[PDB]
Amino acid sequence: LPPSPGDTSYYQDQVDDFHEA
Amino acid sequence: VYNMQSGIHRGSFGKDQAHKGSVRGVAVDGLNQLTVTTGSEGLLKFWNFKNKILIHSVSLSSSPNIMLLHRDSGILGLALDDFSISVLDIETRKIVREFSGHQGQINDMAFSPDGRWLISAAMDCSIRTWDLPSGCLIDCFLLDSAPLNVSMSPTGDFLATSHVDHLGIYLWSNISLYSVVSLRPLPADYVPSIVMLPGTCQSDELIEYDSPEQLNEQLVTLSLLPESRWKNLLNLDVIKKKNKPKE
Amino acid sequence: SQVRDVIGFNMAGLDYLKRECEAKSEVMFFADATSHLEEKKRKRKKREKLIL
Amino acid sequence: KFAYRFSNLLGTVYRRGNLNFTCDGNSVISPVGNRVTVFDLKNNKSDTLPLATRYNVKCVGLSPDGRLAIIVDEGGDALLVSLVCRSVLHHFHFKGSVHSVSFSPDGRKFVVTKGNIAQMYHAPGKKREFNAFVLDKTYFGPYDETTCIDWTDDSRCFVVGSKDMSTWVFGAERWDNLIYYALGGHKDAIVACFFESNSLDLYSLSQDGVLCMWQCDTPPEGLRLKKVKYSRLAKYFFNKEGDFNNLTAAAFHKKSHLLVTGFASGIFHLHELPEFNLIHSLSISDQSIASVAINSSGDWIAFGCSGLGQLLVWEWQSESYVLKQQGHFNSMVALAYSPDGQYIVTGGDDGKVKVWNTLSGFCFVTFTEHSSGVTGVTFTATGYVVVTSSMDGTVRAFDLHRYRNFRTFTSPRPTQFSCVAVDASGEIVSAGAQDSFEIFVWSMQTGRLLDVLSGHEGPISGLCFNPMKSVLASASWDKTVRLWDMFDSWRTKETLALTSDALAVTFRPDGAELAVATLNSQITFWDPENAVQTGSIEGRHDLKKAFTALCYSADGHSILAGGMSKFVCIYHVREQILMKRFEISCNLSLDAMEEFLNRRKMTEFGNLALIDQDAGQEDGVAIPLPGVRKGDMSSRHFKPEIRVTSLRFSPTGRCWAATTTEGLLIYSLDTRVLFDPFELDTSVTPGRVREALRQQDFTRAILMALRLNESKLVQEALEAVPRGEIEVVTSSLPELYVEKVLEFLASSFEVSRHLEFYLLWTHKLLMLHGQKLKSRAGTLLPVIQFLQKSIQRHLDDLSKLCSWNHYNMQYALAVSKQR
Amino acid sequence: EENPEHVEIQKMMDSLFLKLDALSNFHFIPKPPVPEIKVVSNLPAITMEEVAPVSVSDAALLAPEEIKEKNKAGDIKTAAEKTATDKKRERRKKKYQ
Amino acid sequence: GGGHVAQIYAIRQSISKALVAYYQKYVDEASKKEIKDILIQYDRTLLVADPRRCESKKFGGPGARAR
Amino acid sequence: HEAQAVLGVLLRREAPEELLAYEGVRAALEALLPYTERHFQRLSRTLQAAAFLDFLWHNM
Amino acid sequence: CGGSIEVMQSFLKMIGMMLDRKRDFELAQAYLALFLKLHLKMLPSEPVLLEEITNLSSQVEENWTHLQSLFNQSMCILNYLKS
Amino acid sequence: RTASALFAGFRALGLFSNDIPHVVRFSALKRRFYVTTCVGKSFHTYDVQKLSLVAVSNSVPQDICCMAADGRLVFAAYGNVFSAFARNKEIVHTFKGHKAEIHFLQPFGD
Amino acid sequence: GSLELCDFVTASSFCRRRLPTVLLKLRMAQHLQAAVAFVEQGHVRVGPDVVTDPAFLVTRSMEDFVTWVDSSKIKRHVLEYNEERDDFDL
Amino acid sequence: NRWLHIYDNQGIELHCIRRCDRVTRLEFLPFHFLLATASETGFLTYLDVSVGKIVAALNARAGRLDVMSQNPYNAVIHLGHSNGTVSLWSPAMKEPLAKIL
């Protein structure tokens, strides 16, 4: 199941999460 | 000249006026290169559409009544007060055909979509069809009421007309599209005896030739048998092998 | 024309002698050369997947 | 000027519906989607009828006389058309979908089966009426859907099959001894039913494969205008017990007692009915055989396979095929013309490359080496080499000499190819990639990668080589057109900046002008050598938002444009004005089996919507769709839309083609479209021409006939000239009229029996005026290619026989000369 | 014969790859039918597709060099014919290889 | 910004583009067409800016691409 | 050309059935055919090129 | 196959007549070519057939040479124009 | 007996009613009302649910002056002659014997 | 990478490649319902073509070429905020 | 036409049964919560609406099935044929309970 639409992980993969953090 | 989008005047033809008399008809060619005008004085003038410079003027034997242009063919038709119809080529500015035979004032004219036929309606209650390539009359039928307007469908399937006191449009089917017709040249001085009802009821001049089987004995000629019956006679063996179904 | 006629005349001779040999022996001509052709294409066909 | 009309649909031979032979039996009528094609087998010609329909053609009913035909689509819309003149006569709408239509042999009645009922109508007359179809009678026999129709040899009675496992016979006229009769004996739906030659005995065929024979005690003459019994003689099984092979189509020839049966396995059988003797059977394909028809003479049989759209006609006795075709599965194709114009090469998404002959319209060579779809296809300078690019990552070359893939080019790196281009020299081959956005260029004879051109950003819209200069023009989505000169020591490169994204690039045939289509729906004309913009054309309003495809005419005076519109537009390049538009009909049919489409938002396709017309609103009210608990936001939906993928124009200039979603459309030159005289005068008339012929003034007659522009007049005039005076009239001909005669002559060779007479004319004209035409040769390429093609057709086929005869007889003499 | 296991694996890749492409397509492209199991019939069969024109023969498909090999010189020379230069040339090439 | 010559060229381009846009918006499209084609046929720089990039022989390899 | 000149003699001089008697005729017949077609097609092109001079003569 | 030799002689005169009229030319070439392929080997033995071939060989020679020359000149000019 | 070798009369557009009064008839075997109005030398028939044209009759040489309708037949008078129309299109019976124009037609049984 | 990552593909990976959520990643929209709404009116194009189906997976290569369609009211607002509106380009 | 569907009385689709295909006749047994389907292919199927499982799928092996009725007292299914016979069926048996001419 996908996460909540408000969650940033809904539209971000691990590559984007590493740079955004 | 006015712009359709804004309604702004975009110029005029002639230093003061295009013609001395009343303007009888105007037309523009398909490519917006040439403009043709007529005057009651009897002059036919050709203009450049863009810079509005006079190109050529032609004198007319009689005063022009109505004028229509067949854009793609470049053929211009003039009906005069002397009951005659003159046909001119726009590009060369010269007369190509002269049609006569109407006994009344011409109300309207129309072209077939290919441009090979001219149809004219007059006050003698007759509709006449002219074949431009041969320059002969090919059809003439009478009506109870005088025809005011005549028009050909772009597909060429139907002919539409209107009458003097009637409130409706009448459609005529051109019987050529569903049946083969052999055109026969009518005499120019012809008057149609029969009146045809509006709705559903119930020579040297012609152009057709049959080529002989041989022009001369020394001339070598082929047969019209299909290629497949004779061209592959030397290859029959390789043909049959390929036609064998795989076991 | 003469040179072409000499070559062309050899066509009728060899083509006819071709028909007699095929009549005598049931095996057709060029069969071995045909066999090499399918081997050549499949080695080429195998090489193409390897490059991919 | 521009006188072209739609003539052929190429790449499809059969989609769905029943096949039919014409009355004489030489031609076959095949439904292809919206349209209908007629194949003349005797003269191997193909003609696509002008009519089109919103949905696929379901039923075709053909009149016994051969003049009329009725074309019914899935929705129930019907068209009455005349075969002789190829014109649509009438439009009609049946209330629901009809399953079949058949004409009575006498030609006075025709029967349509729909729903549970059978309706009989009067046959339409010759003249047009307001209501062409007039209902006559209506019959309520069966309990389930009616399927198939047959008539007796006399028009006394007819028979209808039904899905209620029974077959019903009715009387066309009121007969006291026969009102209606029902026949059973089947445990599945009826597929076909036939009558005897001159009796009321009949045959019934079930979907299971069961044959039933029924015999009557009353002769057909025994019918009395205002007591008949039927008995089952025999029952036969086509299949062995225990395999479920379904009969799908059948046909029966009454005089020769021949039965042809097609099955879902893709096989067919022949039998002789009163004894049921198996003649033989064949296997055609893995897909089912949808339709079967047999001509009147009984020699030929037609088979259609809907799975791959395969058409075959088989001459059973000599066991040879008269015609055998299979088109691309999808209408999406890529097209190229041969340099002479003799052949057309098409590539498909299946990876299949097909070569079609222009004269006949039939495919004759197929190459299958490509695995994925063909993105681009082209010819070389000669007409004997074709180059293709695909998503495989390979660019392949094929020859027409030995029919082999002799050369394959590949990138060192894994890439896929979107477009291809080759020079007039034929040494240099170029391709572009969907992702790397760089051009790979190889040598033809060497086969190695010469160079990789880089600099573009974004995908390459198109590549084109200058026909005369050997430079490459590439369009890209970085709003640039780049020019690369190959044979330059310093590697010169030119860049043309654009306001919006580039989509198409083409070259004028002379090579001195370049055209670009941009995302703002503008066509810009540039001079390539000086890099200056010479013109522009705006196209928002004409298409009804961009022009995807461009093409130059052979003379170059006009340009052809297409895109997401349903129109193809013809513009005049100098005046920058729109000359013409052609419209494209759309097919709304959708396959029922497909389940990967969200049907709820695709409601306009395939007659899915129900629109209420009895609700008192003029346009209608749509019944609401059922609700769901969970929304489906992962399924694709599509809207009806027409897009022109590409345009190509024949070098001969006689025809052009449009590759679209509906298919591959062919437009041909026709004289009946427009009357185009050269220099008319009141003196110029056919009467004066015949008078000049009678007075033996040949030169003046020819000149007058040439100012007029009917081919028939000049055809009569030249044939009037006797031999020996040919050079006299040839010398008198002015320079302007020369190229007109050669245009006439090339058209003449195709359809004239008098071979060398016209060839005598062609011989003299080229000898006297050949040196002068060399100065104006550049503007005469379409005419020269036209004449060279037609004369070559008679040269090659005659040579191999004449050489074979003369030399073999000489060898025979030499052997006999010995001893 | 070919390994059976490799056959289904590429087959399952084919159906999967078509489905992924269907989502990316801007317009609809119908899918060609695929036989789940093909059954060869005991009846004789004929083919719709044709790889070479029906008129040409198998001899025509063959190149002349295919049936008869050629050396670079295009001529053959026996040992007794060979001069000093010819014998020196072949010895140099033998050393080279 | 810029120098004298660049400012002058920018002013010419701005004036031409502004007039063309005004005639497109509030005047008929035809007159915009003739005026635009005149401005293009004189100098395309009046309406379309083409900035200068770095392209030189040094990027290309020695010799011609073919032959 | 001189190979054809020799071959033209052999075909004409002795009877065909004696040609079948020679050893290796079958293998020799294989290689002769496709190469001979190439020469005939080349000479046919040359004859077409020879027509150009007749065009020169009428233009004098 | 049961067809006597004089029937062949009648057949060979048929092609001579058709070449004489100079009509149906492509069939005359086609019918002769099929006949020659089938019965080439039996021809040189029978003297009656040889004299017919002698007439036919003359007729096909003059006819084809006239046509082939006219074909050649037209084609070479057209290639010259394109070049 | 040929009027035009190229053209034939088909139908008139934009015409619905003239001074001659209309006639209304309920259908047998069908639950339908049709109204018939004279138009020049022909008459049109309409259904009443949508006022949609359903039939166009054959033409007569003179203008129709009086119309009467009964059952399966429609009677129209033109000049001094009147006829009977079947299927709303085609004449089946024509009646002569009057030396003056007809203003009244009364259907009376057979 | 290797086949190890191949076992992580789920419904979430497919949902992340939808057209509306890519707009939400590219900051062209801030809410999913707003991102979905932009699509059907036709304000969003993938290269030359305009896509109205919210169920549409965009490739990595095609993701680089998604933008506002020209002559769209949203693109006017973006240009107005940046003070870069040029009416010659419409 | 192609499968069997379940709808709410307000128009909301609930279940689409992919197994039951080309069904011509439907009939519901109330006290057993069984829905019986007759198909074109010749199959008779029983569905338990209480749980959502197909309890039985029987091959009548008599051709097309188009005539069906139930006995409210008995709860058996009656099937008509072109043979002139009526067949009695129950979900427990794989063969008809009886055949009557």
XYZ file of C-alpha atoms in Angstrom, chain B residues 214 217-225 230 233-234 236-237, chain H residues 20-27 30-31 33-34 37 63 67:
30
model
C -4.154 -2.663 -85.809
C -0.078 -4.470 -91.242
C 3.594 -3.578 -90.796
C 2.866 -2.130 -87.356
C 3.550 -4.593 -84.534
C 0.837 -4.759 -81.875
C 0.322 -6.523 -78.554
C -2.718 -8.252 -77.150
C -4.654 -7.036 -74.128
C -4.424 -10.410 -72.403
C 1.900 -15.577 -70.471
C 5.545 -19.613 -68.844
C 9.274 -20.325 -68.571
C 6.255 -22.950 -64.344
C 8.435 -25.569 -62.648
C 3.500 -12.759 -90.392
C 0.487 -10.705 -89.300
C 2.717 -9.034 -86.668
C -0.202 -9.099 -84.221
C -0.333 -10.894 -80.859
C 3.450 -10.670 -80.770
C 4.001 -11.369 -77.069
C 2.061 -14.641 -77.260
C 5.727 -17.017 -75.257
C 4.225 -20.028 -77.032
C 9.564 -20.494 -75.816
C 7.432 -23.043 -73.972
C 11.933 -25.939 -73.666
C 11.706 -8.311 -85.650
C 12.576 -3.382 -81.620
